[PDB]
Amino acid sequence: LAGLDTAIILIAFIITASVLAYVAINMGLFVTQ
Amino acid sequence: LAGLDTAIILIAFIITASVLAYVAINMGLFVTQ
Amino acid sequence: LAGLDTAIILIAFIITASVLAYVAINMGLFVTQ
Amino acid sequence: KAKSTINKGEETASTALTLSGSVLYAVNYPSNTRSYWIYFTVSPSSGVSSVELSPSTTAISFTASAEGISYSNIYEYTLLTVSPSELANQVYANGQYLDLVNQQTNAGQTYVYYPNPYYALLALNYTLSKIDKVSPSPLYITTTTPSSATQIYPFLAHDNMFTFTLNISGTLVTYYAFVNQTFAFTYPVAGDPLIGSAIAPAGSVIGVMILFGPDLGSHVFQYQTITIQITPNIGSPLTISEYVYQPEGSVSVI
Amino acid sequence: PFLAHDNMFTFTLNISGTLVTYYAFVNQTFAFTYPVAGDPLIGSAIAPAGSVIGVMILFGPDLGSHVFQYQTITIQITPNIGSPLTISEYVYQPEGSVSVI
Amino acid sequence: KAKSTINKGEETASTALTLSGSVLYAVNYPSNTRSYWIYFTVSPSSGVSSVELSPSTTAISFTASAEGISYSNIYEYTLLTVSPSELANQVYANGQYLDLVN
Amino acid sequence: VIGVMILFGPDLGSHVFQYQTITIQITPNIGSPLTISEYVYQPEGSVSVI
Amino acid sequence: KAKSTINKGEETASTALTLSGSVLYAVNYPSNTRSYWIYFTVSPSSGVSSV
């Protein structure tokens, strides 16, 4: 069984995406403003 | 499992481009007027 | 053994990645049209 | 245990706060020496979810690199928590009590908004005096002449004063405001059926006003860059960045 | 008595060949919207595409005592869904008592 | 959750408004000191979507650069909600009624 | 393809959902359950699309 | 007994529904006061199993 391991990698991926997500909104709003 | 994470990385980015599109056309309708 | 567990989980993870493709193409069509 | 943590990680990516309206800026126009206030409205991006704006779990950071200032968490009070019932009566301009708060009703839910930053300011003057007991009053808006205010209260001279005149019952009434520390507050402007909750719903419009104190109000921004960062507890920060050098009248536009 | 602090503007109409005048009284600056072109769904308070919707800003006592002269007047509409409409005009001087500005 | 959210993100980028018609300004002409009213029209950006202008949600703002006076959500009422059956019943200035809503 | 049709009654049909999250969840006896959760803003068309 | 468990464990990991087709909410349009019904279609996830 490996799903017990997939959870750790998965949650970490979501954090990297979230951080990248709003940094785009932060800089995206900046350049437009 | 590339499904669960990339599904969120998707919506984490779809919302990002949505805000950028929101503020981009916001500048557009302002200057033309 | 873990061979049956790995076999069972393999069936589960495919379905989630499959249904993600189901919705990914649908919204890709609707938005593009 | 994994499920809840992945579920919670999903909710984080759906905050999506943005900027609406404009970024006004008003100073003493003839002698551009003092800075009074900054007011800009801030709304959620689209119909994604409700965002949190509580002053206990949010940071608003003001900084200007060209002069070496950097403030953090100047976010102190809000007017979202106060109910319009208690605020309805106790304000007397002349003859009759003027009503600051407005309200509507539709689809079984009532709405609350404020028509002016001035009416929102006066509503803020009363609520700090009576609703939430605090020993230091960061703002004190009075109708007495500023010279008289210095006589009745000594320590009202260090703060920075700026006036806003009105017209009630046909007589021109003036007002004076004194701020002793740079702080910021919020008040609902549109589509906020959640009074008292301090959670901006989807598509709503919220106001954000920053009142300059004495330490910072003595400086005017010329050829400098401004950075205002509204950092909620979860999700996307918002970094208002602008470059201005002159006021262009009594108030600016950007 | 309390209708003395409000603002006033007069408009007349000719009904059944007779001249009738009307006088206004407004105590607060506000604005309202009414249908003006091709709005089938009335009552739902929705503006479909193709339908023009009129907007009328009424002055009041707090502001009507002044007159906008050589200044940038800025009105802005912000719907709940979509990007706001920010109007920014600059006026020299009104003419005819109804000016296009 | 992703699908429903993508559907709304598309709806946000589609709707917009334009200034159809001109903008009018009413002020006492001979002695230009009294403001009367400001009127104009508005319509969706184009044939893309139906926007809702219920005053409970949308908010018309206002500000003046010279006099420094600023406002927020001067939009209070509308006439879209009423039905033409209710208006045309009773109103007149003479012995005969008149119809307002065509 | 099967079709599900929820018929509101007098207790719930007297309301209208607005700026809310609506959740439906079908649960068979074997296999995962389906979890539908949409956020309705404003009903339009007399047949809302969401 | 261990055989029936795996035969049933596989079906649990294989059967799953999915929402195909939009969801329809019907209310009185001129005056949004009532609520009529909600309709939507469901189908198995893929060509994997019946529910």
mmCIF file of all heavy atoms in Angstrom, chain F residues 63-97:
data_model
loop_
_atom_site.group_PDB
_atom_site.id
_atom_site.type_symbol
_atom_site.label_atom_id
_atom_site.label_comp_id
_atom_site.label_asym_id
_atom_site.label_seq_id
_atom_site.Cartn_x
_atom_site.Cartn_y
_atom_site.Cartn_z
ATOM 1 N N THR F 63 -17.574 61.193 -6.313
ATOM 2 C CA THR F 63 -16.551 62.003 -5.670
ATOM 3 C C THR F 63 -16.337 63.265 -6.490
ATOM 4 O O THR F 63 -16.671 63.323 -7.676
ATOM 5 C CB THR F 63 -15.235 61.235 -5.514
ATOM 6 O OG1 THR F 63 -14.224 62.117 -5.011
ATOM 7 C CG2 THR F 63 -14.788 60.674 -6.844
ATOM 8 N N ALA F 64 -15.773 64.277 -5.836
ATOM 9 C CA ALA F 64 -15.473 65.554 -6.473
ATOM 10 C C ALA F 64 -14.057 65.953 -6.097
ATOM 11 O O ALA F 64 -13.712 65.978 -4.913
ATOM 12 C CB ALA F 64 -16.470 66.635 -6.050
ATOM 13 N N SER F 65 -13.240 66.267 -7.103
ATOM 14 C CA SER F 65 -11.830 66.537 -6.847
ATOM 15 C C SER F 65 -11.628 67.889 -6.177
ATOM 16 O O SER F 65 -10.866 68.000 -5.211
ATOM 17 C CB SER F 65 -11.041 66.464 -8.152
ATOM 18 O OG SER F 65 -11.730 67.122 -9.199
ATOM 19 N N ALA F 66 -12.296 68.930 -6.676
ATOM 20 C CA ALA F 66 -12.065 70.273 -6.154
ATOM 21 C C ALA F 66 -12.624 70.431 -4.746
ATOM 22 O O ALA F 66 -11.878 70.706 -3.801
ATOM 23 C CB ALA F 66 -12.676 71.316 -7.089
ATOM 24 N N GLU F 67 -13.934 70.254 -4.588
ATOM 25 C CA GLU F 67 -14.564 70.427 -3.285
ATOM 26 C C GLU F 67 -14.201 69.329 -2.299
ATOM 27 O O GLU F 67 -14.651 69.385 -1.150
ATOM 28 C CB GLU F 67 -16.082 70.500 -3.445
ATOM 29 C CG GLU F 67 -16.615 71.909 -3.640
ATOM 30 C CD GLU F 67 -16.138 72.543 -4.932
ATOM 31 O OE1 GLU F 67 -15.830 71.798 -5.886
ATOM 32 O OE2 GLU F 67 -16.070 73.788 -4.992
ATOM 33 N N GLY F 68 -13.411 68.338 -2.711
ATOM 34 C CA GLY F 68 -12.960 67.291 -1.822
ATOM 35 C C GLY F 68 -14.036 66.369 -1.301
ATOM 36 O O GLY F 68 -13.713 65.422 -0.575
ATOM 37 N N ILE F 69 -15.301 66.604 -1.640
ATOM 38 C CA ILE F 69 -16.378 65.778 -1.117
ATOM 39 C C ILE F 69 -16.371 64.432 -1.827
ATOM 40 O O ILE F 69 -16.278 64.359 -3.060
ATOM 41 C CB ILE F 69 -17.727 66.499 -1.267
ATOM 42 C CG1 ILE F 69 -18.876 65.605 -0.795
ATOM 43 C CG2 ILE F 69 -17.936 66.969 -2.700
ATOM 44 C CD1 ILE F 69 -20.084 66.381 -0.314
ATOM 45 N N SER F 70 -16.452 63.358 -1.048
ATOM 46 C CA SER F 70 -16.464 62.003 -1.574
ATOM 47 C C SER F 70 -17.678 61.265 -1.035
ATOM 48 O O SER F 70 -18.189 61.581 0.042
ATOM 49 C CB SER F 70 -15.187 61.246 -1.202
ATOM 50 O OG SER F 70 -15.329 60.607 0.053
ATOM 51 N N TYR F 71 -18.138 60.275 -1.797
ATOM 52 C CA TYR F 71 -19.331 59.531 -1.419
ATOM 53 C C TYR F 71 -19.121 58.037 -1.601
ATOM 54 O O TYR F 71 -18.033 57.597 -1.981
ATOM 55 C CB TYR F 71 -20.532 59.993 -2.243
ATOM 56 C CG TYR F 71 -21.371 61.051 -1.570
ATOM 57 C CD1 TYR F 71 -20.974 62.378 -1.565
ATOM 58 C CD2 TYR F 71 -22.562 60.723 -0.944
ATOM 59 C CE1 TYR F 71 -21.737 63.346 -0.955
ATOM 60 C CE2 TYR F 71 -23.333 61.685 -0.330
ATOM 61 C CZ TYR F 71 -22.914 62.995 -0.338
ATOM 62 O OH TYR F 71 -23.680 63.959 0.274
ATOM 63 N N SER F 72 -20.161 57.252 -1.333
ATOM 64 C CA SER F 72 -20.109 55.809 -1.528
ATOM 65 C C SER F 72 -21.515 55.228 -1.540
ATOM 66 O O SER F 72 -22.295 55.462 -0.614
ATOM 67 C CB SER F 72 -19.266 55.146 -0.438
ATOM 68 O OG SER F 72 -17.893 55.459 -0.594
ATOM 69 N N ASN F 73 -21.843 54.474 -2.585
ATOM 70 C CA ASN F 73 -23.143 53.826 -2.730
ATOM 71 C C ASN F 73 -24.286 54.829 -2.595
ATOM 72 O O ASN F 73 -25.120 54.748 -1.693
ATOM 73 C CB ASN F 73 -23.302 52.682 -1.728
ATOM 74 C CG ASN F 73 -24.473 51.779 -2.059
ATOM 75 O OD1 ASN F 73 -25.155 51.974 -3.064
ATOM 76 N ND2 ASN F 73 -24.703 50.778 -1.221
ATOM 77 N N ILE F 74 -24.311 55.795 -3.517
ATOM 78 C CA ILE F 74 -25.475 56.666 -3.646
ATOM 79 C C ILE F 74 -26.623 55.978 -4.361
ATOM 80 O O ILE F 74 -27.688 56.584 -4.532
ATOM 81 C CB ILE F 74 -25.119 57.969 -4.387
ATOM 82 C CG1 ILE F 74 -25.014 57.714 -5.889
ATOM 83 C CG2 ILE F 74 -23.820 58.539 -3.855
ATOM 84 C CD1 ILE F 74 -24.789 58.964 -6.701
ATOM 85 N N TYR F 75 -26.437 54.732 -4.784
ATOM 86 C CA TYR F 75 -27.483 53.971 -5.452
ATOM 87 C C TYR F 75 -28.393 53.348 -4.403
ATOM 88 O O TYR F 75 -27.957 52.491 -3.626
ATOM 89 C CB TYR F 75 -26.858 52.896 -6.338
ATOM 90 C CG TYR F 75 -27.839 52.145 -7.203
ATOM 91 C CD1 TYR F 75 -29.016 52.735 -7.622
ATOM 92 C CD2 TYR F 75 -27.586 50.845 -7.598
ATOM 93 C CE1 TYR F 75 -29.910 52.050 -8.412
ATOM 94 C CE2 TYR F 75 -28.475 50.156 -8.387
ATOM 95 C CZ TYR F 75 -29.633 50.760 -8.789
ATOM 96 O OH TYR F 75 -30.519 50.068 -9.577
ATOM 97 N N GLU F 76 -29.651 53.777 -4.375
ATOM 98 C CA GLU F 76 -30.596 53.326 -3.363
ATOM 99 C C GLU F 76 -31.808 52.624 -3.952
ATOM 100 O O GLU F 76 -32.182 51.546 -3.478
ATOM 101 C CB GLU F 76 -31.051 54.515 -2.507
ATOM 102 C CG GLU F 76 -29.914 55.277 -1.857
ATOM 103 C CD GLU F 76 -30.385 56.525 -1.147
ATOM 104 O OE1 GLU F 76 -31.588 56.847 -1.246
ATOM 105 O OE2 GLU F 76 -29.556 57.187 -0.490
ATOM 106 N N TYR F 77 -32.437 53.203 -4.971
ATOM 107 C CA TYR F 77 -33.718 52.720 -5.461
ATOM 108 C C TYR F 77 -33.658 52.484 -6.962
ATOM 109 O O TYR F 77 -32.739 52.933 -7.648
ATOM 110 C CB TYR F 77 -34.840 53.709 -5.130
ATOM 111 C CG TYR F 77 -34.946 54.019 -3.658
ATOM 112 C CD1 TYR F 77 -34.977 55.329 -3.206
ATOM 113 C CD2 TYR F 77 -35.002 53.000 -2.718
ATOM 114 C CE1 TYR F 77 -35.069 55.617 -1.861
ATOM 115 C CE2 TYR F 77 -35.097 53.277 -1.371
ATOM 116 C CZ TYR F 77 -35.129 54.587 -0.948
ATOM 117 O OH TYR F 77 -35.221 54.869 0.396
ATOM 118 N N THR F 78 -34.661 51.768 -7.463
ATOM 119 C CA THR F 78 -34.781 51.494 -8.886
ATOM 120 C C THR F 78 -36.251 51.315 -9.231
ATOM 121 O O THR F 78 -37.104 51.164 -8.353
ATOM 122 C CB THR F 78 -33.990 50.253 -9.295
ATOM 123 O OG1 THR F 78 -34.090 50.071 -10.711
ATOM 124 C CG2 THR F 78 -34.541 49.026 -8.596
ATOM 125 N N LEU F 79 -36.538 51.330 -10.530
ATOM 126 C CA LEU F 79 -37.890 51.140 -11.034
ATOM 127 C C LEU F 79 -38.055 49.845 -11.812
ATOM 128 O O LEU F 79 -39.128 49.608 -12.372
ATOM 129 C CB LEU F 79 -38.299 52.324 -11.916
ATOM 130 C CG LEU F 79 -38.766 53.579 -11.183
ATOM 131 C CD1 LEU F 79 -39.138 54.666 -12.175
ATOM 132 C CD2 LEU F 79 -39.939 53.254 -10.275
ATOM 133 N N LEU F 80 -37.022 49.004 -11.868
ATOM 134 C CA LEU F 80 -37.148 47.734 -12.571
ATOM 135 C C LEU F 80 -38.081 46.778 -11.840
ATOM 136 O O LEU F 80 -38.741 45.951 -12.478
ATOM 137 C CB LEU F 80 -35.773 47.091 -12.743
ATOM 138 C CG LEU F 80 -34.748 47.854 -13.581
ATOM 139 C CD1 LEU F 80 -33.374 47.229 -13.430
ATOM 140 C CD2 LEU F 80 -35.166 47.875 -15.038
ATOM 141 N N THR F 81 -38.158 46.883 -10.513
ATOM 142 C CA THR F 81 -38.913 45.907 -9.734
ATOM 143 C C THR F 81 -40.414 46.091 -9.905
ATOM 144 O O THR F 81 -41.171 45.114 -9.870
ATOM 145 C CB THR F 81 -38.531 46.005 -8.259
ATOM 146 O OG1 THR F 81 -39.165 47.150 -7.676
ATOM 147 C CG2 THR F 81 -37.025 46.136 -8.108
ATOM 148 N N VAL F 82 -40.870 47.332 -10.077
ATOM 149 C CA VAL F 82 -42.302 47.578 -10.184
ATOM 150 C C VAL F 82 -42.816 47.062 -11.522
ATOM 151 O O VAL F 82 -42.065 46.927 -12.496
ATOM 152 C CB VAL F 82 -42.614 49.074 -10.007
ATOM 153 C CG1 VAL F 82 -41.968 49.596 -8.737
ATOM 154 C CG2 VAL F 82 -42.143 49.862 -11.215
ATOM 155 N N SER F 83 -44.098 46.763 -11.568
ATOM 156 C CA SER F 83 -44.743 46.263 -12.769
ATOM 157 C C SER F 83 -45.638 47.336 -13.379
ATOM 158 O O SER F 83 -46.261 48.118 -12.655
ATOM 159 C CB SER F 83 -45.574 45.016 -12.450
ATOM 160 O OG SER F 83 -46.257 44.535 -13.593
ATOM 161 N N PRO F 84 -45.729 47.398 -14.711
ATOM 162 C CA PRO F 84 -46.506 48.475 -15.347
ATOM 163 C C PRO F 84 -47.993 48.418 -15.057
ATOM 164 O O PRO F 84 -48.706 49.368 -15.403
ATOM 165 C CB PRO F 84 -46.225 48.276 -16.841
ATOM 166 C CG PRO F 84 -45.856 46.842 -16.965
ATOM 167 C CD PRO F 84 -45.115 46.504 -15.707
ATOM 168 N N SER F 85 -48.488 47.345 -14.440
ATOM 169 C CA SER F 85 -49.900 47.294 -14.079
ATOM 170 C C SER F 85 -50.196 48.200 -12.893
ATOM 171 O O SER F 85 -51.292 48.764 -12.793
ATOM 172 C CB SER F 85 -50.311 45.856 -13.770
ATOM 173 O OG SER F 85 -50.074 45.546 -12.408
ATOM 174 N N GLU F 86 -49.232 48.354 -11.984
ATOM 175 C CA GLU F 86 -49.462 49.123 -10.766
ATOM 176 C C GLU F 86 -49.373 50.624 -11.011
ATOM 177 O O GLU F 86 -50.112 51.399 -10.396
ATOM 178 C CB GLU F 86 -48.463 48.702 -9.689
ATOM 179 C CG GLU F 86 -48.661 47.287 -9.167
ATOM 180 C CD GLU F 86 -48.035 46.233 -10.062
ATOM 181 O OE1 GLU F 86 -48.119 46.373 -11.301
ATOM 182 O OE2 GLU F 86 -47.471 45.257 -9.528
ATOM 183 N N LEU F 87 -48.482 51.053 -11.904
ATOM 184 C CA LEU F 87 -48.271 52.482 -12.106
ATOM 185 C C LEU F 87 -49.446 53.123 -12.835
ATOM 186 O O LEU F 87 -49.937 54.184 -12.431
ATOM 187 C CB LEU F 87 -46.972 52.721 -12.874
ATOM 188 C CG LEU F 87 -45.697 52.895 -12.047
ATOM 189 C CD1 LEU F 87 -45.814 54.118 -11.152
ATOM 190 C CD2 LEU F 87 -45.384 51.653 -11.226
ATOM 191 N N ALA F 88 -49.917 52.489 -13.907
ATOM 192 C CA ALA F 88 -50.887 53.115 -14.799
ATOM 193 C C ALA F 88 -52.290 53.205 -14.211
ATOM 194 O O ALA F 88 -53.207 53.611 -14.933
ATOM 195 C CB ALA F 88 -50.937 52.357 -16.126
ATOM 196 N N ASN F 89 -52.494 52.846 -12.943
ATOM 197 C CA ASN F 89 -53.844 52.867 -12.389
ATOM 198 C C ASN F 89 -54.332 54.290 -12.155
ATOM 199 O O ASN F 89 -55.308 54.732 -12.772
ATOM 200 C CB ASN F 89 -53.904 52.054 -11.096
ATOM 201 C CG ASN F 89 -53.612 50.586 -11.318
ATOM 202 O OD1 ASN F 89 -54.519 49.754 -11.315
ATOM 203 N ND2 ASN F 89 -52.347 50.261 -11.520
ATOM 204 N N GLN F 90 -53.669 55.033 -11.271
ATOM 205 C CA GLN F 90 -54.198 56.324 -10.845
ATOM 206 C C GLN F 90 -53.078 57.345 -10.708
ATOM 207 O O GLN F 90 -52.163 57.175 -9.897
ATOM 208 C CB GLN F 90 -55.001 56.180 -9.538
ATOM 209 C CG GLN F 90 -54.222 56.035 -8.223
ATOM 210 C CD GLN F 90 -53.470 54.719 -8.096
ATOM 211 O OE1 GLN F 90 -52.859 54.235 -9.048
ATOM 212 N NE2 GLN F 90 -53.515 54.133 -6.905
ATOM 213 N N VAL F 91 -53.125 58.366 -11.562
ATOM 214 C CA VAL F 91 -52.399 59.619 -11.386
ATOM 215 C C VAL F 91 -52.931 60.604 -12.420
ATOM 216 O O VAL F 91 -53.258 60.213 -13.546
ATOM 217 C CB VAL F 91 -50.874 59.426 -11.504
ATOM 218 C CG1 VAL F 91 -50.478 59.049 -12.919
ATOM 219 C CG2 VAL F 91 -50.141 60.680 -11.051
ATOM 220 N N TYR F 92 -53.043 61.878 -12.049
ATOM 221 C CA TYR F 92 -53.451 62.897 -13.007
ATOM 222 C C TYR F 92 -53.170 64.279 -12.442
ATOM 223 O O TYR F 92 -52.977 64.455 -11.237
ATOM 224 C CB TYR F 92 -54.934 62.775 -13.392
ATOM 225 C CG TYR F 92 -55.915 62.725 -12.240
ATOM 226 C CD1 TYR F 92 -56.159 63.842 -11.451
ATOM 227 C CD2 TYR F 92 -56.619 61.564 -11.960
ATOM 228 C CE1 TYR F 92 -57.063 63.798 -10.408
ATOM 229 C CE2 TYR F 92 -57.525 61.510 -10.919
ATOM 230 C CZ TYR F 92 -57.743 62.629 -10.146
ATOM 231 O OH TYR F 92 -58.645 62.578 -9.108
ATOM 232 N N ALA F 93 -53.149 65.257 -13.346
ATOM 233 C CA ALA F 93 -53.105 66.665 -12.989
ATOM 234 C C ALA F 93 -54.338 67.417 -13.466
ATOM 235 O O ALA F 93 -54.461 68.617 -13.192
ATOM 236 C CB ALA F 93 -51.843 67.327 -13.559
ATOM 237 N N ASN F 94 -55.249 66.749 -14.168
ATOM 238 C CA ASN F 94 -56.482 67.352 -14.650
ATOM 239 C C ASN F 94 -57.601 66.333 -14.469
ATOM 240 O O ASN F 94 -57.447 65.327 -13.771
ATOM 241 C CB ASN F 94 -56.338 67.807 -16.108
ATOM 242 C CG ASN F 94 -55.655 69.152 -16.234
ATOM 243 O OD1 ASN F 94 -55.779 70.008 -15.360
ATOM 244 N ND2 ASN F 94 -54.931 69.347 -17.329
ATOM 245 N N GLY F 95 -58.739 66.593 -15.113
ATOM 246 C CA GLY F 95 -59.888 65.711 -14.991
ATOM 247 C C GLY F 95 -59.686 64.326 -15.571
ATOM 248 O O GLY F 95 -60.533 63.453 -15.345
ATOM 249 N N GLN F 96 -58.598 64.097 -16.304
ATOM 250 C CA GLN F 96 -58.348 62.815 -16.945
ATOM 251 C C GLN F 96 -56.988 62.278 -16.523
ATOM 252 O O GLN F 96 -56.024 63.037 -16.386
ATOM 253 C CB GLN F 96 -58.415 62.934 -18.474
ATOM 254 C CG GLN F 96 -57.441 63.937 -19.066
ATOM 255 C CD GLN F 96 -56.168 63.283 -19.559
ATOM 256 O OE1 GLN F 96 -56.209 62.303 -20.302
ATOM 257 N NE2 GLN F 96 -55.028 63.817 -19.141
ATOM 258 N N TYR F 97 -56.921 60.965 -16.321
ATOM 259 C CA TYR F 97 -55.675 60.310 -15.959
ATOM 260 C C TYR F 97 -54.701 60.326 -17.134
ATOM 261 O O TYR F 97 -55.057 60.653 -18.268
ATOM 262 C CB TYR F 97 -55.931 58.866 -15.523
ATOM 263 C CG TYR F 97 -56.786 58.717 -14.283
ATOM 264 C CD1 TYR F 97 -58.154 58.950 -14.324
ATOM 265 C CD2 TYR F 97 -56.227 58.326 -13.075
ATOM 266 C CE1 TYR F 97 -58.938 58.810 -13.195
ATOM 267 C CE2 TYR F 97 -57.003 58.182 -11.942
ATOM 268 C CZ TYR F 97 -58.358 58.426 -12.008
ATOM 269 O OH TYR F 97 -59.133 58.285 -10.881
#
